[PDB]
Amino acid sequence: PVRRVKSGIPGFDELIEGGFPEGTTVLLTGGTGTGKTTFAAQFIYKGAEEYGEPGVFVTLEERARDLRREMASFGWDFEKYEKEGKIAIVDGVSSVVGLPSFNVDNFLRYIYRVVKAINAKRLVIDSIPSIALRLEEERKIREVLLKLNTILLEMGVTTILTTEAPGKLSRYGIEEFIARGVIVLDLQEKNIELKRYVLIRKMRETRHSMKKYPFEIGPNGIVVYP
Amino acid sequence: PVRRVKSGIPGFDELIEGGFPEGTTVLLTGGTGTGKTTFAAQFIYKGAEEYGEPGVFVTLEERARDLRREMASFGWDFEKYEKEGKIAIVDFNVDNFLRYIYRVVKAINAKRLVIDSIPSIALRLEEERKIREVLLKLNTILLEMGVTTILTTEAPGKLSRYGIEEFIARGVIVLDLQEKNIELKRYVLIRKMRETRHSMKKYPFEIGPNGIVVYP
Amino acid sequence: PVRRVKSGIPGFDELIEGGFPEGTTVLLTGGTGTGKTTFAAQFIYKGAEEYGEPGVFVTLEERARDLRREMASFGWDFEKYEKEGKIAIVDFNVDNFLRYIYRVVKAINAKRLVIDSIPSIALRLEEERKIREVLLKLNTILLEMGVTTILTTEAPGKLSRYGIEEFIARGVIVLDLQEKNIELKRYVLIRKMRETRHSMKKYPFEIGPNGIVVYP
Amino acid sequence: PVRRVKSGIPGFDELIEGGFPEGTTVLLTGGTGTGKTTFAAQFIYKGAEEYGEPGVFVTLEERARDLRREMASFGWDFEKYEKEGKIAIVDFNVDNFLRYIYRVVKAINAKRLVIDSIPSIALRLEEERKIREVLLKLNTILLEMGVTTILTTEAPGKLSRYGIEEFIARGVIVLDLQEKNIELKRYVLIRKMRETRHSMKKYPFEIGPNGIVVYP
Amino acid sequence: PVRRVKSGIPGFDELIEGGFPEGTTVLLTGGTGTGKTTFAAQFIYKGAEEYGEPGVFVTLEERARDLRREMASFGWDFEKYEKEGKIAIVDFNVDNFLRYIYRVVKAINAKRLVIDSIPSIALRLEEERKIREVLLKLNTILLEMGVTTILTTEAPGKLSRYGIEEFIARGVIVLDLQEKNIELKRYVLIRKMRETRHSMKKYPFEIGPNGIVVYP
Amino acid sequence: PVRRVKSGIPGFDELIEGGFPEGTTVLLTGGTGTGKTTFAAQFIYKGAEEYGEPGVFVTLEERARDLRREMASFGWDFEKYEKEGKIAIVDGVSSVVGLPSFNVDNFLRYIYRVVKAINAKRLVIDSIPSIALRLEEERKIREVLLKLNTILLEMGVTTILTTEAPGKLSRYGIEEFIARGVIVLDLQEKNIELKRYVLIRKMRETRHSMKKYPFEIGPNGIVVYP
Ligand SMILES: Nc1ncnc2c1ncn2[C@@H]1O[C@H](COP(=O)(O)OP(=O)(O)O)[C@@H](O)[C@H]1O
Ligand SMILES: Nc1ncnc2c1ncn2[C@@H]1O[C@H](COP(=O)(O)OP(=O)(O)O)[C@@H](O)[C@H]1O
Ligand SMILES: Nc1ncnc2c1ncn2[C@@H]1O[C@H](COP(=O)(O)OP(=O)(O)O)[C@@H](O)[C@H]1O
Ligand SMILES: Nc1ncnc2c1ncn2[C@@H]1O[C@H](COP(=O)(O)OP(=O)(O)O)[C@@H](O)[C@H]1O
Ligand SMILES: Nc1ncnc2c1ncn2[C@@H]1O[C@H](COP(=O)(O)OP(=O)(O)O)[C@@H](O)[C@H]1O
Ligand SMILES: Nc1ncnc2c1ncn2[C@@H]1O[C@H](COP(=O)(O)OP(=O)(O)O)[C@@H](O)[C@H]1O
Ligand SMILES: [Mg+2]
Ligand SMILES: [Mg+2]
Ligand SMILES: [Mg+2]
Ligand SMILES: [Mg+2]
Ligand SMILES: [Mg+2]
Ligand SMILES: [Mg+2]
């Protein structure tokens, strides 16, 4: 009887039999501006606020203060849950408060330390391209992804990793090999208007819907519709 | 008079005159989430449970505890058959990897073998394109062992990820997801199948509570 | 309340809840001749004339006299506002480039910045693909300056020339030329804008005697 | 009068004015599972049985026992004709490979030759792209032997895998699988044949219990 | 108040408000045989004959005697105007090539310049991709000289052969051949044109006994 | 008043105002088996037989004896004109008879010598890919093409060069830069049948037809139709 992590996104859990199987790494993929960051933030924020599960949002796309400001526009008070120790933001430039002190191995050690310090049940790495673009050699993302996979398996948290391609499921062709779930966010062209769609392409241990579902990014975040 | 190895997948054997010809290496290809790991698990697991044939499931995609756990969602108790010595799950050194599968296959007298997946091997090499040399080395031991094997590979067009996998298989099975009208629907096709007048049609299938079923 | 920077482009602000969130880096992308330089130049120029906001226009695609003469054809007198200290035109050493932009921005207390263009920077490097490392250095100084910036890039498919520009922007505007049936017509689309419920539709626009006008 | 070598494929000779001009090197190309090995094997086998003409089948895609067992499923008894000296099966050092083919061909006075396949040679090289230099060395020995040869290559677009194979052939046969509407159906087309006014149309064919049959 | 340089091509000036803005570098792009060399010749040759403006035609595509000979097929006597010192034809050392065009342009007080073609330069480099560095060097002297220049490039989609040429031009003219129904018909389009509200329509043209004519 | 070289191909000269301008290099391009070799051979053979102009056929695609045998199937007796000195075939393995003794510079010297020895007015190089595939480095075809161009200009003969692509006009993207004429041979798909078409894409000094023309390879070679 699989334990399920509620996504935090109204309309979504019903597509995946109540939520993500505990312990799954989910690849959230889509083009620029399809809602990846938002959807990942909602997962962590709602995890903490509605379901009381601590979460770590790792970002190399922006700084922590950018994410707090941006998510405030949905009414989400990240800093409130940070002071309560239910959320940490790892950007790192700024060390998480209370957890002081591109280098891949330090990075991964530090995410592991922070997951363990708050007893995180939820984790986001936004994004894989943000990591890759910071390496000496962008194609070593291959070796970095295999190191990440090893620490995800050890930590056993429920994780969203984001990646970005416009055919291709992912940017590098590798990201999907370390994920047991895949969610696509898209903007379809019809006919002078782009509407947002989500599709669950893959989800382990789950008889998930295989249909495209409309969605909106509203004043209170993502809502998925019939 | 070719001896046939039953797939374990309802609706599938009838497409290939009763089964896989014994000793064949079969390439199982399809995009992410098209049912490859499930198909290969079903072939090993029903081999043991229903046909009493020992089998080896080699996974570099995940670990044995993940595979056991995921497969119980379909009613399949992999550990029961591991302790009876009817299934082994094998969880980068290429030559040792190969030696070890060889030894486990002999050790349990396997008749079925799965390697899930070729990309998973290749992504662990120092240079990913050395999968070419690795595949030729793997072809050589498959030929020695003479078991019935499913290798999995994954491409989005192109039949395989590297354009090489198909040169060491004598059968190819494609799993797919099609567009219709705002739903994704699953299909299987036998592209090639030595010694067999197999169907060339596309068939719908479902992945349900008892795993894969192929329809008319 | 998010504080917004008015574009200077008639018909455009209502597409983005009144203007660009202050401090945003916006990528403006489009093929040759889709109107990127004019859009950028209008943002800086109307910022100075219409709203009093000082602005820096960095160009490696042309010299400062070229841009002055060219924008005069729209009735825009750049030199007037340069003399009043409300516009600076900045006309290969990457670190010195970046330091200089930061200086000029500070010196006039700039609220607006344009860099025209990312490709024009890349093409002057020892190795073109080092734009990746250059774009990362730009990002850190944009985040430090906290001004409102337009960066242009050019491709006609792909969003950007290099596949990297979009990762340092929190807004994306696409300018396009569509064929219908004998004639190319200009369209703008807002692909991304942080903190903004923007329109997602394609709008027609034209470049006329007073620069860009976006239509319903 | 051009002397022609009868294919052994029912329905095919009439497409090429009765057969292959003697001494021609013919490239047979097609995707995985389009029937290239069967076509080649039928050319050698029916050459021996039907016309008395001795033939060499070189394969790096499988072992000799594999091809014997596989072709038995068509009622073809390769070993009978091997024992009578009318068929040789030749089952990485390029020069030694080539020398050996030339020897076996001379030893049985072969009129027919197959090499299955060009990719299977390329994939065994130290560097795959050295097939260019290998194909040039093959060409010179085919021209010396003056037998009638089929070379296979595989791509599904491009005519050949490497873009080079076609330059050492004076005939080209394409085997294909076309979708209609639920089913893959097999077609053959003669793209090129020297000294021959061949048909230029696509013909259906099937692989049945007696091998290939081409239809109107 | 922008000064305009008449094209010399009937039907074309009216598409660009009377002519090219003085000092502009114009990229003229199109596939093989779309009329580029003819268009550029016509611009230099009518410049001299009809408008009394000196011009330089730089060709690395062919030699001066070929160009004179080909152009007389259109009634154009290039040598007459070479001896009056109103046209020069310039027939690998990059820096010397550049120095030399500079000197010939000064030497005859040229107002018009053609370089036919960018690919022709690039194909003569030690490394063809150094055309990037060469183009930036050429941009620097075009900016110094301030003449009105047509550069030609050739791509089959992509606007240019290298994706770089368009970053040193402030106008782009596309010449094309379209499919209709079993004939190829010629068209011209102005993609971009600084300082000009130019037509965005596609226009048919003919290359006749008097060279290029543009139609409605 | 341009001097014109009659192509030798019935139905063709009318497309190019009576023939090729004397001295032109023409790129003959098309996919495998579209008639390139045949069309080039007809030009040389008919040049010699019908119009009395000596011709050199250079081939690295096949040997001279292969070409004589192959062209005999059209009724063309190459060896007859070879003994009369009106045609030479350069393959080279075999030196042209009477002109004794991969190396690029030797190659080009030898074609120049043979053109000059028979006072050739016609030249064929079948094919550019055949040269390129024999080089140490296939991409040096670029440098080889510029050397070829220099000797073509010096010799002033009327030349066909053949190249082979299936979008792309040529195999390498370079061949068209040394040619002042381009002819495409194609096979169009309609509807289970491939029919042959020729199109003149470019021809210097000529108001050539711009239409696709059907053609056949018949028992007496190419014939082009209305
Ligand atoms: N508060 C808001 N209200 C409504 N929509 C918003 C709001 N903030 C941002 N958006 C929308 O969400 C988008 C940002 O999505 P984002 O999650 O950053 O995409 P990605 O990470 O895929 O590039 C904006 O481009 C905008 O369309
Ligand atoms: N227990 C379940 N019940 C129904 N469907 C399931 C169940 N578990 C997994 N699936 C389906 O099977 C898919 C997993 O298939 P999988 O064999 O891993 O594909 P692949 O290896 O090609 O990526 C999931 O995406 C889901 O759709
Ligand atoms: N003064 C003008 N009046 C009307 N249209 C103009 C004027 N100047 C330029 N244009 C039009 O605007 C275009 C300029 O586009 P530009 O901003 O330079 O595009 P980009 O930077 O994307 O290449 C010209 O191609 C022309 O079509
Ligand atoms: N005994 C048989 N009877 C009928 N069909 C067969 C038989 N054996 C093989 N086939 C069919 O012929 C195919 C063999 O094709 P093959 O010659 O090996 O193709 P290729 O070399 O191009 O990959 C099999 O995929 C199958 O469809
Ligand atoms: N004197 C002529 N009369 C009519 N058309 C001609 C004449 N000379 C050349 N042409 C046409 O012009 C074409 C040459 O155009 P050109 O300017 O060289 O194109 P490009 O440089 O783009 O390859 C020839 O292909 C032919 O169609
Ligand atoms: N004597 C013949 N009679 C009729 N057609 C022939 C004859 N000889 C060859 N052909 C046709 O001509 C073709 C050969 O064309 P070829 O000039 O070698 O093409 P390419 O050099 O473009 O590959 C053959 O493929 C065949 O269709
Ligand atoms: Mg994001
Ligand atoms: Mg799998
Ligand atoms: Mg611009
Ligand atoms: Mg085969
Ligand atoms: Mg030209
Ligand atoms: Mg040929």
PDB file of N, CA, C and O in Angstrom, chain D residues 2 21-22 132 136 139 143-144 159 163-164 166-167 170 172 189 191-192 194-195 197 200-202, chain F residues 31-33 61-63 66 69-70 73 129 133-138 164 171 187 192-194 196:
ATOM      1  N   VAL D   2      24.495  -8.626 -72.852  1.00  0.00           N
ATOM      2  CA  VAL D   2      25.025  -8.655 -71.472  1.00  0.00           C
ATOM      3  C   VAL D   2      24.605  -9.951 -70.778  1.00  0.00           C
ATOM      4  O   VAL D   2      23.445 -10.312 -70.796  1.00  0.00           O
ATOM      5  N   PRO D  21      23.719  -7.896 -64.294  1.00  0.00           N
ATOM      6  CA  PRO D  21      24.873  -8.027 -65.197  1.00  0.00           C
ATOM      7  C   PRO D  21      26.019  -8.707 -64.436  1.00  0.00           C
ATOM      8  O   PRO D  21      26.348  -8.343 -63.337  1.00  0.00           O
ATOM      9  N   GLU D  22      26.625  -9.711 -65.026  1.00  0.00           N
ATOM     10  CA  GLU D  22      27.741 -10.430 -64.407  1.00  0.00           C
ATOM     11  C   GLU D  22      28.863  -9.463 -64.030  1.00  0.00           C
ATOM     12  O   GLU D  22      29.212  -8.513 -64.784  1.00  0.00           O
ATOM     13  N   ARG D 132      35.741   4.191 -44.611  1.00  0.00           N
ATOM     14  CA  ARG D 132      35.943   4.865 -45.904  1.00  0.00           C
ATOM     15  C   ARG D 132      37.138   4.218 -46.576  1.00  0.00           C
ATOM     16  O   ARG D 132      37.047   3.707 -47.692  1.00  0.00           O
ATOM     17  N   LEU D 136      37.281   1.338 -49.840  1.00  0.00           N
ATOM     18  CA  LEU D 136      38.145   1.562 -50.997  1.00  0.00           C
ATOM     19  C   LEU D 136      38.988   0.305 -51.242  1.00  0.00           C
ATOM     20  O   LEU D 136      39.170  -0.099 -52.373  1.00  0.00           O
ATOM     21  N   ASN D 139      36.688  -2.434 -52.737  1.00  0.00           N
ATOM     22  CA  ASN D 139      36.390  -2.063 -54.135  1.00  0.00           C
ATOM     23  C   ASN D 139      37.439  -2.652 -55.051  1.00  0.00           C
ATOM     24  O   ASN D 139      37.096  -3.321 -56.033  1.00  0.00           O
ATOM     25  N   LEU D 143      36.767  -5.601 -57.911  1.00  0.00           N
ATOM     26  CA  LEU D 143      37.081  -5.342 -59.306  1.00  0.00           C
ATOM     27  C   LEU D 143      38.041  -6.428 -59.786  1.00  0.00           C
ATOM     28  O   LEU D 143      37.873  -6.943 -60.850  1.00  0.00           O
ATOM     29  N   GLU D 144      38.976  -6.850 -58.955  1.00  0.00           N
ATOM     30  CA  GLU D 144      39.881  -7.953 -59.332  1.00  0.00           C
ATOM     31  C   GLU D 144      39.168  -9.329 -59.503  1.00  0.00           C
ATOM     32  O   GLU D 144      39.305 -10.047 -60.525  1.00  0.00           O
ATOM     33  N   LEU D 159      20.632   7.068 -48.270  1.00  0.00           N
ATOM     34  CA  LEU D 159      20.601   5.777 -48.924  1.00  0.00           C
ATOM     35  C   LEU D 159      21.357   4.677 -48.132  1.00  0.00           C
ATOM     36  O   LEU D 159      21.014   3.535 -48.187  1.00  0.00           O
ATOM     37  N   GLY D 163      27.107   7.062 -46.064  1.00  0.00           N
ATOM     38  CA  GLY D 163      27.228   7.914 -47.263  1.00  0.00           C
ATOM     39  C   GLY D 163      28.346   7.541 -48.255  1.00  0.00           C
ATOM     40  O   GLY D 163      28.691   8.350 -49.111  1.00  0.00           O
ATOM     41  N   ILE D 164      28.932   6.352 -48.156  1.00  0.00           N
ATOM     42  CA  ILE D 164      30.089   5.950 -48.958  1.00  0.00           C
ATOM     43  C   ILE D 164      29.902   4.640 -49.775  1.00  0.00           C
ATOM     44  O   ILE D 164      30.423   4.489 -50.875  1.00  0.00           O
ATOM     45  N   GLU D 166      27.510   3.479 -51.546  1.00  0.00           N
ATOM     46  CA  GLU D 166      26.992   3.639 -52.915  1.00  0.00           C
ATOM     47  C   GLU D 166      28.065   3.922 -53.999  1.00  0.00           C
ATOM     48  O   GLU D 166      27.857   3.626 -55.179  1.00  0.00           O
ATOM     49  N   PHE D 167      29.217   4.453 -53.586  1.00  0.00           N
ATOM     50  CA  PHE D 167      30.281   4.754 -54.503  1.00  0.00           C
ATOM     51  C   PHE D 167      31.098   3.554 -54.913  1.00  0.00           C
ATOM     52  O   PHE D 167      31.860   3.658 -55.881  1.00  0.00           O
ATOM     53  N   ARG D 170      27.635  -0.671 -58.485  1.00  0.00           N
ATOM     54  CA  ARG D 170      26.985  -0.189 -59.703  1.00  0.00           C
ATOM     55  C   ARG D 170      25.496  -0.587 -59.793  1.00  0.00           C
ATOM     56  O   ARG D 170      24.857  -0.445 -60.839  1.00  0.00           O
ATOM     57  N   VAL D 172      21.897  -0.592 -57.030  1.00  0.00           N
ATOM     58  CA  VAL D 172      21.348  -0.298 -55.753  1.00  0.00           C
ATOM     59  C   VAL D 172      19.942  -0.794 -55.648  1.00  0.00           C
ATOM     60  O   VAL D 172      19.089  -0.364 -56.382  1.00  0.00           O
ATOM     61  N   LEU D 189      12.513  -1.583 -54.363  1.00  0.00           N
ATOM     62  CA  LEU D 189      12.756  -0.630 -55.419  1.00  0.00           C
ATOM     63  C   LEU D 189      14.218  -0.796 -55.936  1.00  0.00           C
ATOM     64  O   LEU D 189      15.182  -0.925 -55.157  1.00  0.00           O
ATOM     65  N   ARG D 191      16.899   1.187 -57.457  1.00  0.00           N
ATOM     66  CA  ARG D 191      17.279   2.570 -57.599  1.00  0.00           C
ATOM     67  C   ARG D 191      18.279   2.764 -58.749  1.00  0.00           C
ATOM     68  O   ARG D 191      18.278   3.799 -59.399  1.00  0.00           O
ATOM     69  N   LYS D 192      19.136   1.764 -58.965  1.00  0.00           N
ATOM     70  CA  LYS D 192      20.225   1.844 -59.951  1.00  0.00           C
ATOM     71  C   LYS D 192      20.577   0.444 -60.360  1.00  0.00           C
ATOM     72  O   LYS D 192      20.558  -0.457 -59.529  1.00  0.00           O
ATOM     73  N   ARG D 194      23.380  -0.778 -63.560  1.00  0.00           N
ATOM     74  CA  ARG D 194      24.148  -0.492 -64.773  1.00  0.00           C
ATOM     75  C   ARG D 194      23.767  -1.437 -65.885  1.00  0.00           C
ATOM     76  O   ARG D 194      23.363  -2.595 -65.644  1.00  0.00           O
ATOM     77  N   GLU D 195      23.893  -0.923 -67.110  1.00  0.00           N
ATOM     78  CA  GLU D 195      23.705  -1.692 -68.342  1.00  0.00           C
ATOM     79  C   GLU D 195      22.298  -2.315 -68.412  1.00  0.00           C
ATOM     80  O   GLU D 195      22.087  -3.305 -69.108  1.00  0.00           O
ATOM     81  N   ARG D 197      17.990  -1.518 -68.372  1.00  0.00           N
ATOM     82  CA  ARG D 197      16.793  -0.681 -68.312  1.00  0.00           C
ATOM     83  C   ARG D 197      15.912  -1.353 -67.278  1.00  0.00           C
ATOM     84  O   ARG D 197      15.079  -2.214 -67.581  1.00  0.00           O
ATOM     85  N   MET D 200      11.501   1.289 -62.426  1.00  0.00           N
ATOM     86  CA  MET D 200      11.729   2.346 -61.455  1.00  0.00           C
ATOM     87  C   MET D 200      10.583   2.418 -60.440  1.00  0.00           C
ATOM     88  O   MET D 200      10.559   3.318 -59.605  1.00  0.00           O
ATOM     89  N   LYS D 201       9.654   1.486 -60.499  1.00  0.00           N
ATOM     90  CA  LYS D 201       8.537   1.480 -59.577  1.00  0.00           C
ATOM     91  C   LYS D 201       8.852   0.680 -58.301  1.00  0.00           C
ATOM     92  O   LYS D 201       9.690  -0.163 -58.299  1.00  0.00           O
ATOM     93  N   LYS D 202       8.107   0.941 -57.252  1.00  0.00           N
ATOM     94  CA  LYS D 202       8.158   0.240 -55.964  1.00  0.00           C
ATOM     95  C   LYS D 202       7.276  -0.954 -56.128  1.00  0.00           C
ATOM     96  O   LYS D 202       6.192  -0.817 -56.653  1.00  0.00           O
TER      97      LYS D 202
ATOM     98  N   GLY F  31      21.303  12.661 -57.070  1.00  0.00           N
ATOM     99  CA  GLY F  31      21.465  11.466 -56.239  1.00  0.00           C
ATOM    100  C   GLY F  31      21.984  10.290 -57.031  1.00  0.00           C
ATOM    101  O   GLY F  31      22.114  10.308 -58.274  1.00  0.00           O
ATOM    102  N   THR F  32      22.331   9.248 -56.318  1.00  0.00           N
ATOM    103  CA  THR F  32      22.816   8.035 -56.960  1.00  0.00           C
ATOM    104  C   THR F  32      21.813   7.569 -58.046  1.00  0.00           C
ATOM    105  O   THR F  32      20.604   7.459 -57.808  1.00  0.00           O
ATOM    106  N   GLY F  33      22.309   7.379 -59.269  1.00  0.00           N
ATOM    107  CA  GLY F  33      21.531   6.686 -60.256  1.00  0.00           C
ATOM    108  C   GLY F  33      20.611   7.608 -60.959  1.00  0.00           C
ATOM    109  O   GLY F  33      19.647   7.157 -61.563  1.00  0.00           O
ATOM    110  N   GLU F  61      35.522   7.019 -60.230  1.00  0.00           N
ATOM    111  CA  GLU F  61      34.404   6.158 -59.828  1.00  0.00           C
ATOM    112  C   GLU F  61      34.551   4.725 -60.367  1.00  0.00           C
ATOM    113  O   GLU F  61      34.059   3.741 -59.814  1.00  0.00           O
ATOM    114  N   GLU F  62      35.184   4.589 -61.512  1.00  0.00           N
ATOM    115  CA  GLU F  62      35.309   3.255 -62.086  1.00  0.00           C
ATOM    116  C   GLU F  62      36.585   3.150 -62.944  1.00  0.00           C
ATOM    117  O   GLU F  62      37.302   4.138 -63.125  1.00  0.00           O
ATOM    118  N   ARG F  63      36.882   1.978 -63.485  1.00  0.00           N
ATOM    119  CA  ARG F  63      38.050   1.942 -64.346  1.00  0.00           C
ATOM    120  C   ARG F  63      37.660   2.163 -65.834  1.00  0.00           C
ATOM    121  O   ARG F  63      36.480   2.103 -66.191  1.00  0.00           O
ATOM    122  N   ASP F  66      35.636  -0.450 -67.505  1.00  0.00           N
ATOM    123  CA  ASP F  66      34.276  -0.511 -66.999  1.00  0.00           C
ATOM    124  C   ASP F  66      33.449   0.484 -67.767  1.00  0.00           C
ATOM    125  O   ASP F  66      32.322   0.215 -68.132  1.00  0.00           O
ATOM    126  N   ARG F  69      32.848  -0.710 -71.440  1.00  0.00           N
ATOM    127  CA  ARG F  69      31.835  -1.788 -71.424  1.00  0.00           C
ATOM    128  C   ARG F  69      30.437  -1.207 -71.141  1.00  0.00           C
ATOM    129  O   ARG F  69      29.458  -1.573 -71.789  1.00  0.00           O
ATOM    130  N   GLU F  70      30.349  -0.281 -70.187  1.00  0.00           N
ATOM    131  CA  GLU F  70      29.056   0.217 -69.774  1.00  0.00           C
ATOM    132  C   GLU F  70      28.438   1.053 -70.885  1.00  0.00           C
ATOM    133  O   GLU F  70      27.248   0.928 -71.168  1.00  0.00           O
ATOM    134  N   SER F  73      26.669  -0.404 -74.057  1.00  0.00           N
ATOM    135  CA  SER F  73      25.263  -0.754 -73.996  1.00  0.00           C
ATOM    136  C   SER F  73      24.343   0.317 -74.569  1.00  0.00           C
ATOM    137  O   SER F  73      23.177   0.046 -74.853  1.00  0.00           O
ATOM    138  N   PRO F 129      33.051  13.644 -55.326  1.00  0.00           N
ATOM    139  CA  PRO F 129      33.116  12.739 -54.149  1.00  0.00           C
ATOM    140  C   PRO F 129      34.143  11.604 -54.327  1.00  0.00           C
ATOM    141  O   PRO F 129      34.711  11.214 -53.350  1.00  0.00           O
ATOM    142  N   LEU F 133      36.803  11.118 -51.377  1.00  0.00           N
ATOM    143  CA  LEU F 133      36.855   9.891 -50.588  1.00  0.00           C
ATOM    144  C   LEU F 133      38.227   9.270 -50.620  1.00  0.00           C
ATOM    145  O   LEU F 133      38.514   8.465 -49.759  1.00  0.00           O
ATOM    146  N   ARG F 134      39.064   9.625 -51.601  1.00  0.00           N
ATOM    147  CA  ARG F 134      40.442   9.078 -51.676  1.00  0.00           C
ATOM    148  C   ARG F 134      41.499   9.875 -50.960  1.00  0.00           C
ATOM    149  O   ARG F 134      42.655   9.456 -50.870  1.00  0.00           O
ATOM    150  N   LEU F 135      41.134  11.023 -50.423  1.00  0.00           N
ATOM    151  CA  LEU F 135      42.117  11.841 -49.751  1.00  0.00           C
ATOM    152  C   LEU F 135      42.348  11.321 -48.318  1.00  0.00           C
ATOM    153  O   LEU F 135      41.509  10.577 -47.717  1.00  0.00           O
ATOM    154  N   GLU F 136      43.500  11.699 -47.785  1.00  0.00           N
ATOM    155  CA  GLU F 136      43.845  11.437 -46.387  1.00  0.00           C
ATOM    156  C   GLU F 136      42.717  11.951 -45.521  1.00  0.00           C
ATOM    157  O   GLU F 136      42.216  11.276 -44.626  1.00  0.00           O
ATOM    158  N   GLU F 137      42.317  13.192 -45.788  1.00  0.00           N
ATOM    159  CA  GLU F 137      41.289  13.849 -45.018  1.00  0.00           C
ATOM    160  C   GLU F 137      40.224  14.363 -46.012  1.00  0.00           C
ATOM    161  O   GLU F 137      40.510  15.219 -46.847  1.00  0.00           O
ATOM    162  N   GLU F 138      39.027  13.789 -45.935  1.00  0.00           N
ATOM    163  CA  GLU F 138      37.958  14.027 -46.870  1.00  0.00           C
ATOM    164  C   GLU F 138      37.606  15.501 -46.951  1.00  0.00           C
ATOM    165  O   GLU F 138      37.440  16.034 -48.033  1.00  0.00           O
ATOM    166  N   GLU F 164      27.356  14.373 -55.928  1.00  0.00           N
ATOM    167  CA  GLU F 164      26.190  13.596 -55.529  1.00  0.00           C
ATOM    168  C   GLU F 164      25.718  13.905 -54.104  1.00  0.00           C
ATOM    169  O   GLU F 164      26.469  13.634 -53.169  1.00  0.00           O
ATOM    170  N   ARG F 171      27.299  17.681 -52.417  1.00  0.00           N
ATOM    171  CA  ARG F 171      27.726  16.864 -51.321  1.00  0.00           C
ATOM    172  C   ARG F 171      28.407  17.704 -50.272  1.00  0.00           C
ATOM    173  O   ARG F 171      28.137  17.506 -49.090  1.00  0.00           O
ATOM    174  N   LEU F 187      14.968  12.192 -59.524  1.00  0.00           N
ATOM    175  CA  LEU F 187      13.916  11.191 -59.644  1.00  0.00           C
ATOM    176  C   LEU F 187      12.822  11.631 -58.722  1.00  0.00           C
ATOM    177  O   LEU F 187      13.048  11.671 -57.500  1.00  0.00           O
ATOM    178  N   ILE F 192       3.641   5.280 -57.346  1.00  0.00           N
ATOM    179  CA  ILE F 192       4.509   4.124 -57.083  1.00  0.00           C
ATOM    180  C   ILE F 192       5.651   4.062 -58.088  1.00  0.00           C
ATOM    181  O   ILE F 192       6.320   3.027 -58.142  1.00  0.00           O
ATOM    182  N   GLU F 193       5.832   5.147 -58.880  1.00  0.00           N
ATOM    183  CA  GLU F 193       6.829   5.247 -59.984  1.00  0.00           C
ATOM    184  C   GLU F 193       7.778   6.477 -59.864  1.00  0.00           C
ATOM    185  O   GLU F 193       7.323   7.618 -59.640  1.00  0.00           O
ATOM    186  N   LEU F 194       9.089   6.249 -60.030  1.00  0.00           N
ATOM    187  CA  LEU F 194      10.072   7.347 -60.056  1.00  0.00           C
ATOM    188  C   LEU F 194      10.330   7.802 -61.502  1.00  0.00           C
ATOM    189  O   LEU F 194      10.798   7.029 -62.292  1.00  0.00           O
ATOM    190  N   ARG F 196      12.294  10.483 -64.285  1.00  0.00           N
ATOM    191  CA  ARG F 196      13.496  11.312 -64.302  1.00  0.00           C
ATOM    192  C   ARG F 196      13.214  12.723 -64.781  1.00  0.00           C
ATOM    193  O   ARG F 196      12.482  12.935 -65.753  1.00  0.00           O
TER     194      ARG F 196
END
